[PDB]
Amino acid sequence: ASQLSPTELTEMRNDLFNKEKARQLSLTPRTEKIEVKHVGKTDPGTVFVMNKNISTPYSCAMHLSEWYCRKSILALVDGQPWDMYKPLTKSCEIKFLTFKDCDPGEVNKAYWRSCAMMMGCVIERAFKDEYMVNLVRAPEVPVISGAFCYDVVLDSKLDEWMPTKENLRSFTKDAHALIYKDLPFETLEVEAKVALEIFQHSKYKVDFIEEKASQNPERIVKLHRIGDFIDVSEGPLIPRTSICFQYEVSAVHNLQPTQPSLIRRFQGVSLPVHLRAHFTIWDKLLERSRKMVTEDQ
Amino acid sequence: EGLIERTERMKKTMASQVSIRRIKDYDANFKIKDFPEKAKDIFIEAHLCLNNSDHDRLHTLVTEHCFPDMTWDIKYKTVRWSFVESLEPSHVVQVRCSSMMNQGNVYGQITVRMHTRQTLAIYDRFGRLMYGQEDVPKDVLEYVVFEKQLTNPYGSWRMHTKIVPPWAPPKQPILKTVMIPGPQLKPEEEYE
Amino acid sequence: ISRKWEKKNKIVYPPQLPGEPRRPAEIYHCRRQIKYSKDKMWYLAKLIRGMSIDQALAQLEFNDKKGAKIIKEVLLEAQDMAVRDHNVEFRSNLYIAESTSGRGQCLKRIRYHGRGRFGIMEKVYCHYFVKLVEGPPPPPEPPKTAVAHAKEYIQQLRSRTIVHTL
Amino acid sequence: AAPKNRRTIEVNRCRRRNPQKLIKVKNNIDVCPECGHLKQKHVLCAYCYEKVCKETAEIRRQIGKQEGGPFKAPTIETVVLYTGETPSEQDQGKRIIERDRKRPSWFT
Ligand SMILES: [Mg+2]
Ligand SMILES: [Zn+2]
Numbered sequence A: 001a002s003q004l005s006p007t008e009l010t011e012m013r014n015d016l017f018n019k020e021k022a023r024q025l026s027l028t029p030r031t032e033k034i035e036v037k038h039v040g041k042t043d044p045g046t047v048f049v050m051n052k053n054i055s056t057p058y059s060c061a062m063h064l065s066e067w068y069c070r071k072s073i074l075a076l077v078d079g080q081p082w083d084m085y086k087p088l089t090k091s092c093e094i095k096f097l098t099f100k101d102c103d104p105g106e107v108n109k110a111y112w113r114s115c116a117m118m119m120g121c122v123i124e125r126a127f128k129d130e131y132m133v134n135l136v137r138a139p140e141v142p143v144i145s146g147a148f149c150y151d152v153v154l155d156s157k158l159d160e161w162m163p164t165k166e167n168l169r170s171f172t173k174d175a176h177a178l179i180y181k182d183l184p185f186e187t188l189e190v191e192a193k194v195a196l197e198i199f200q201h202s203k204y205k206v207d208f209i210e211e212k213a214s215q216n217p218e219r220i221v222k223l224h225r226i227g228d229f230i231d232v233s234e235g236p237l238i239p240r241t242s243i244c245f246q247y248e249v250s251a252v253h254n255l256q257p258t259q260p261s262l263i264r265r266f267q268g269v270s271l272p273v274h275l276r277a278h279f280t281i282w283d284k285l286l287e288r289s290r291k292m293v294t295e296d297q
Numbered sequence B: 001e002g003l004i005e006r007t008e009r010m011k012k013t014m015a016s017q018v019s020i021r022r023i024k025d026y027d028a029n030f031k032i033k034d035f036p037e038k039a040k041d042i043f044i045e046a047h048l049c050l051n052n053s054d055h056d057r058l059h060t061l062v063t064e065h066c067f068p069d070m071t072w073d074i075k076y077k078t079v080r081w082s083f084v085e086s087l088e089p090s091h092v093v094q095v096r097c098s099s100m101m102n103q104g105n106v107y108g109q110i111t112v113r114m115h116t117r118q119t120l121a122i123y124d125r126f127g128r129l130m131y132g133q134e135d136v137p138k139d140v141l142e143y144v145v146f147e148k149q150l151t152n153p154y155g156s157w158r159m160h161t162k163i164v165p166p167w168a169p170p171k172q173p174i175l176k177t178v179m180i181p182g183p184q185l186k187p188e189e190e191y192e
Numbered sequence C: 001i002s003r004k005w006e007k008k009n010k011i012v013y014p015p016q017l018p019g020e021p022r023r024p025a026e027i028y029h030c031r032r033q034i035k036y037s038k039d040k041m042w043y044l045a046k047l048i049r050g051m052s053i054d055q056a057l058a059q060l061e062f063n064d065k066k067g068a069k070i071i072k073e074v075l076l077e078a079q080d081m082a083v084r085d086h087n088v089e090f091r092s093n094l095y096i097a098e099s100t101s102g103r104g105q106c107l108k109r110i111r112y113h114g115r116g117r118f119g120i121m122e123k124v125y126c127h128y129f130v131k132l133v134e135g136p137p138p139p140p141e142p143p144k145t146a147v148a149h150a151k152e153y154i155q156q157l158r159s160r161t162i163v164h165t166l
Numbered sequence D: 001a002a003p004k005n006r007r008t009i010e011v012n013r014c015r016r017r018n019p020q021k022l023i024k025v026k027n028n029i030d031v032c033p034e035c036g037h038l039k040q041k042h043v044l045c046a047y048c049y050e051k052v053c054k055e056t057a058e059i060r061r062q063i064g065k066q067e068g069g070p071f072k073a074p075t076i077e078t079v080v081l082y083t084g085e086t087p088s089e090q091d092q093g094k095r096i097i098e099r100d101r102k103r104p105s106w107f108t
Helices: A006-027 A058-064 A105-123 A165-180 A192-199 A203-214 A279-288 B007-026 B035-051 B055-061 B067-074 C038-048 C053-061 C066-084 C146-159 D009-015 D046-066
Strands: A047-051 A074-077 A080-083 A134-137 A148-153 A186-191 A220-226 A229-232 A244-254 A263-272 B079-098 B107-122 B133-149 B158-163 B178-180 C026-034 C094-100 C107-110 C120-123 C126-134 D078-081 D095-098
Touching: A006 A186, A006 A192, A006 A220, A006 A229, A047 A058, A074 A105, A080 A105, A105 A148, A105 A165, A105 A220, A105 A229, A105 A244, A105 A263, A134 A203, A165 A244, A186 A192, A192 A203, A192 A220, A203 A220, A203 A229, A244 A279, A263 A279, B007 B079, B007 B107, B035 B055, B035 B067, B035 B079, B035 B107, B035 B133, B035 B158, B055 B067, B055 B158, B079 B133, C026 C066, C038 C053, C038 C066, C038 C094, C038 C126, C053 C066, C053 C094, C066 C094, C066 C126, D046 D095
Parallel strands: D078 D095
Antiparallel strands: A047 B178, A074 A080, A134 A148, A148 A263, A186 A220, A220 A229, A244 A263, B079 B107, B107 B133, B133 B158, C026 C126, C094 C126, C107 C120
8 A cells, every 4th residue: 555646556556466477377387278168059079189378268169169158158057157258177078158149147247247347347447536535346146137336435525526428428438439449358367475576555346356356265356357447246157348338337326325435336338249238228328327226235 | 027938029130130131132332220320310410400401301301201291291291390309329220121022112110219308389380389398308219120122223211201109108189179070961850 | 274273382581680579471372173163162262262271170170161171171181281291380370362263274065955956065163262361360450430430531621622713 | 148258356354354243252151050050141050950850760750650641630739758857747649749859958
């Protein structure tokens, strides 16, 4: 905890991230072969021979066809959802998940984690630098509610204002600037010690890291990155940020009475490129998401 | 120390000695204990002329059985090969001869083990690295048999083939990922 | 008869230095003497020219022409030789670079017109060439906006001189 | 009427190569949810339709065996059975065609 400009903080954070990723890649010495199997439906019995801790499941979908690259959003390594750009470890059996599948609930949760994380990325770089922004967390709300939510403490100077429609449309236009550049959701699975050594300043991030490290016995939390943003989340993400097509932040709401300081919950709604809606239905969904989502218990 | 029942090992030695007897009965003035040096340098410059892609010297160094077995899959690739160091002095392990009278020929096959270290770096036809590594003396031991047609009056000693033991360690892996496709179905059901 | 498109797969480049880019793989393949006219085959070759190989197969599986099955066979076996022989590692990661059609050797017949008159009916044949290059398909050249038009016009006006004098 | 001059290759290339004559890219195409064999929207998948027509052909061959000659065409519903698969009580009067296979996992 010290005085730091907001840019040298992201410099030291993504430099430490790149150092840990280089160490993760360098720990394995050679090219080890793993035999990932395809236990899906369409092309059964296919067995790839991959490079261990190098090859992604996107690099397994590239072997088959281009449609496995276009429409597959999450992998399913043996029982567990694996994000499409995470290097495989052991000899496994794999299966790809799409948006128009029969039971897409896991990939819906993954999509809304990724959209809430994008909203945090677009909130944290839009405010005045003399004001302080502390990204608290994104609580895992179910997708049956209309919007994804992200929790942010604003400045002590700003316990009185609320944004008009122009600031919200500025937020969505910056989020569309984020969407228009096709960026990879890069993951990295780090120990709790290195992860706590990354952040070091946001005490809200510190207790969230401790909460996610307390539940597994190895103390490993899931870090992710879009470009130069680094955030904590539970579970996997979607591959690219260009999968989102219709994006919007709806409103903000203040939830005071549980705490002295004021936490502001930013809300917004999204839809992928394969599941886009007509303008009328989209305005209906945009209209519902202004109401406050409260599903935490 | 020797194991139990050493007499059958001496019987293998007897079979090797009666084959040496047959090669000497055909062609005398043939020393035995300098043939590992001939074997080693034949092996080495055979692989060097494979590196230079010069078939006309390979034909007098290696035989018609292993010329496609060493030249076929390398036709558009480029091999960079280098014998760096002899680890252990080579040894003759089996001498045999066959009396196949189909056209009055007899062949004498010398099996000789060799334990050494080489480098190997196989590239692609576009010049991309494919299999090996440039400057590392990775060690391998190989049992290679030689062969000279005795009845032919010119008859060099050419490398015939190499026998791979079943307990051999698997070779170093490929640099590229590989897809093995499953059963390609007609309208049917996949049963496995 | 000249067959040089077949021999282009036998080029072997020197081994690349470590401080160099990748040099993507190049695969030439062709099918000679197809019983199909070279213009109608050219329309399909112009359809493919820039697309990726999976998109090319997708467009050619649903195009209702005689040459579509032929070019689908050629592209499938070129994909197979690219993965097997020329050391492309990903089956999907190939785009069509060149795609064209040439005249093949034709025969001649009589057509038996309706008096004691006749024409020379010609039994048409053609070729199909294709060249694959590994890598993602290149982005299309975007149409020039008004900024580029204005910049080129001002560059033109800045370029002019006082002609026919010192 | 006859041509008065030979059309050159420039005029011909301007005619036979414009976008009104080129082949239009279609984008109706996606993978089939079962069997992944690249159907078109608004069109049944040819692989799945080939499956169904092969099984229908074998059922029709067994029907043609059971009906003897032509002009027979019974006045009862029919129903097909695979190996195992005892007739249900609701399929009492219905004609029973049993070929020999396991029941495939799309025909229920
Ligand atoms: Mg007449
Ligand atoms: Zn289908």
